[PDB]
Design a protein around this ligand. Structure first.
Ligand SMILES: *[C@@H]1O[C@H](CO)[C@@H](O[C@@H]2O[C@H](CO)[C@@H](O)[C@H](O)[C@H]2NC(C)=O)[C@H](O)[C@H]1NC(C)=O
Ligand SMILES: *[C@@H]1O[C@H](CO)[C@@H](O)[C@H](O)[C@H]1NC(C)=O
Ligand SMILES: *[C@@H]1O[C@H](CO)[C@@H](O)[C@H](O)[C@H]1NC(C)=O
Ligand SMILES: *[C@@H]1O[C@H](CO)[C@@H](O)[C@H](O)[C@H]1NC(C)=O
Ligand SMILES: *[C@@H]1O[C@H](CO)[C@@H](O)[C@H](O)[C@H]1NC(C)=O
Ligand SMILES: *[C@@H]1O[C@H](CO)[C@@H](O)[C@H](O)[C@H]1NC(C)=O
Ligand SMILES: *[C@@H]1O[C@H](CO)[C@@H](O)[C@H](O)[C@H]1NC(C)=O
Ligand SMILES: *[C@@H]1O[C@H](CO)[C@@H](O)[C@H](O)[C@H]1NC(C)=O
Lengths: 163, 254, 49, 99
């Protein structure tokens, strides 16, 4: 080898990578990509192969250091540990609920109110009940007889629609 | 280098009661204030656990089966028990697993060791004697890690081999009981998972001699065998398994 | 055990809900009980089955 | 409500007509810190290489390999992957690599 050589006589360093896969457990993988953690939003989470959809909030459950996920009685993942920063996150399910329409007769009026059951009013004449969020009904401080039952002691009537 | 130990005293190995020992965490999932029924390879309650001694002249390094899994208990003072050997034929024909804890570090190697008939470490009164294997030709897995370790210390280990995965569970307990296994409950936390992917049917305990012939330091260990069964585990408010029920022991626990 | 009649109804309803939730963990002869695993592992002709 | 009740006239009352489910917005795929990278620097940037009759073999195992620091390196004159696509190396997991 001289440095004055032409191409094809110059030295070439060659590395041959042979990826072989025997049925022993595989231990050579690529970089597992990670993205910034977003909390308090209904996101699709994928934590160490455990996937799902939920709202990831801060948790007061103190895990033991070998434990990663958390399950309730009904075997649903409600707590998890972030692998980047060892912190515990609660996985609340994303809000779902029945949509009910409260109306008088169409012979009387076409005005309606909408009840989103078990849904907070910030996640949808807006009133928060224990039955859910009621939109389109004016809440009054007076007490009358029950005309249209809403639930949890709340009733609706037509006089506009009041609750 | 291999050395036959020819000054042993003939004595049958002993047997004793497992009580409620050998329970390990079956998975990596946090559970709190719950009663969870799980079916896994567990050590049965109040079972016949085999007892081996090291006392002076007893030096118990026999050939034991591995079967589906091994519970290894150690009533230890002054650090005689140092590691384990796993394999099928324990020679260069098959591939064998070495776990050692010498005076510096913990070494795990998967090689085809030509093992001695009596593998051992030694302490001179300093460690200057190591006779475990005579050769090591084809090595696939190496892993150097942290040190895992009247009888003062209790060491519980659970060794399992499922789907090419070697699960080692460990628990360290301060005790002050003289001779036998203390009666109580302690759930074994997972120590390490090794992707060794080898067939294991036989295993060896590695001990250490004391030289000043040879003298065996006072130590005792216990070997039990795991069986597939159901336990009802109780998880407290802190996520720690505090009590267990063997589902097939007696009709009350059933 | 004075109030056992109400507690029996509460326990039966809670046990029925727990059994109905637990039945989602069963695959019923399929390869998995998780729908996302089937939809990410298989083509739609066999994932339909 | 008229669609649900199959009628053009609706009697006074409350009628459960539909459902509202919050729908996801982002995907968060959090993984452990990328640690114990494979020692490709001791293979490619080695001071002394071997001859071809006595070629060196390094058993790359028990580590994670960033293959796209090689495929995006300007230095290599030849980069020919035969059994595998080049960009798919960061996703496929192999039992071990021989260099
Ligand atoms: C320690 O004792 C064992 C058991 O006797 C020895 O193993 C035998 O060694 C002889 C040597 O020729 C072989 O022919 C036998 O086949 C061996 N038996 C087994 C079961 O392997 C061992 O060699 C002794 N150690 C030393 C250093 O001599
Ligand atoms: C990952 O890195 C962060 C900071 O870079 C550190 O705080 C965290 O402990 C690391 N994760 C582990 C498991 O060590
Ligand atoms: C344990 O086994 C030995 C022999 O295998 C037997 O003599 C002994 O009685 C057994 N112990 C119990 C508690 O059954
Ligand atoms: C312990 O074993 C390792 C691996 O063989 C070795 O490098 C080290 O020197 C040993 N230490 C002692 C004190 O023997
Ligand atoms: C195992 O080692 C022997 C002797 O060193 C050698 O002849 C054989 O090819 C090796 N086998 C493998 C699979 O490495
Ligand atoms: C593992 O070893 C045992 C005992 O040597 C043998 O019976 C069994 O067939 C082996 N397993 C396989 C898959 O060869
Ligand atoms: C749980 O932990 C708290 C402190 O974090 C402690 O006060 C309490 O005694 C523990 N409970 C049990 C059953 O150990
Ligand atoms: C060799 O070193 C150079 C400069 O430090 C770097 O760009 C290159 O990636 C290295 N090669 C490897 C790590 O294979």
């Amino acid at each position: 080898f001289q440095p004055t050589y032409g191409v094809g006589y110059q030295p070439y360093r060659v590395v041959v990578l042979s990826f072989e896969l025997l049925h022993a457990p595989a231990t050579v993988c690529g970089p597992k990509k990670s993205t910034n953690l977003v909390k308090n939003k209904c996101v699709n989470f994928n934590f160490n192969g455990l996937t799902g959809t939920g709202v990831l909030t801060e948790s007061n459950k103190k895990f033991l250091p070998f434990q990663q996920f958390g399950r309730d009685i009904a075997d649903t993942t409600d707590a998890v540990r972030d692998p980047q920063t060892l912190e515990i996150l609660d996985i609340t399910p994303c809000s779902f609920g029945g949509v009910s329409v409260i109306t008088p007769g169409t012979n009387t009026s076409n005005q309606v109110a909408v009840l989103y059951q078990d849904v907070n009013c910030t996640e949808v004449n807006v009133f928060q009940t224990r039955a859910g969020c009621l939109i389109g009904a004016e809440h009054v401080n007076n007490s009358y007889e029950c005309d249209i039952p809403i639930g949890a002691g709340i009733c609706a009537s037509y006089q506009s629609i009041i609750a | 280098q291999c050395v036959n130990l020819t000054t042993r005293t003939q004595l049958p190995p002993a047997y004793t009661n497992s009580f409620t020992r050998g329970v390990y965490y079956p998975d990596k999932v946090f559970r709190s204030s719950v009663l969870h029924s799980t079916q896994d390879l567990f050590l049965p309650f109040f079972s016949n656990v085999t007892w081996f001694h090291a006392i002076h002249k007893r030096f118990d390094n026999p050939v034991l089966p591995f079967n589906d899994g091994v519970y290894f208990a150690s009533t230890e003072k002054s650090n005689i028990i140092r590691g384990w050997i796993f394999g099928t034929t324990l020679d260069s024909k098959t591939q064998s697993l070495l776990i050692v804890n010498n005076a510096t570090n913990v070494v795990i190697k998967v090689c085809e060791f030509q093992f001695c008939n009596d593998p051992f470490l030694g302490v001179y009164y300093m460690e200057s004697e190591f006779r475990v294997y005579s050769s090591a030709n084809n090595c696939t897995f190496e892993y150097v890690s942290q040190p895992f370790l009247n009888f003062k210390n209790l060491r519980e280990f659970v060794f399992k081999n499922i789907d090419g995965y070697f699960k080692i569970y460990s628990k360290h307990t301060p005790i002050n009981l003289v001779r036998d296994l203390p009666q109580g409950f302690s759930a074994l936390e997972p120590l390490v998972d090794l992707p060794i992917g080898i067939n294991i049917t036989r295993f060896q305990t590695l001990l250490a001699l004391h030289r000043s012939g040879w003298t065996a330091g006072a130590a005792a260990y216990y070997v039990g065998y795991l069986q597939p069964r159901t336990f009802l585990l109780k998880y407290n408010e802190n996520g720690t398994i505090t009590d267990a029920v063997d589902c097939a022991l007696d009709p009350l626990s059933e | 055990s004075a109030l056992g009649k109400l507690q029996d109804v509460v326990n039966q309803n809670a046990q029925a809900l727990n059994t109905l939730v637990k039945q989602l963990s069963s695959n019923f002869g399929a390869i998995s009980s998780v729908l996302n695993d089937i939809l990410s592992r298989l083509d739609p002709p066999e994932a339909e089955v | 409500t008229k669609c649900t009740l199959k009628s053009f006239t609706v009697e006074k009352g409350i009628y459960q007509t539909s459902n509202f489910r919050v729908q996801p917005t982002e995907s968060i795929v959090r993984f452990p810190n990328i640690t114990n990278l494979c020692p490709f620097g001791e293979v490619f940037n080695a001071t002394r290489f071997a001859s071809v009759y006595a070629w060196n073999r390094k058993r790359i195992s028990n580590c994670v390999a960033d293959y796209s620091v090689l495929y995006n390196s300007a230095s290599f004159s030849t980069f020919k992957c035969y059994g595998v696509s080049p960009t798919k190396l960061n996703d496929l997991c192999f039992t071990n690599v021989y260099a």
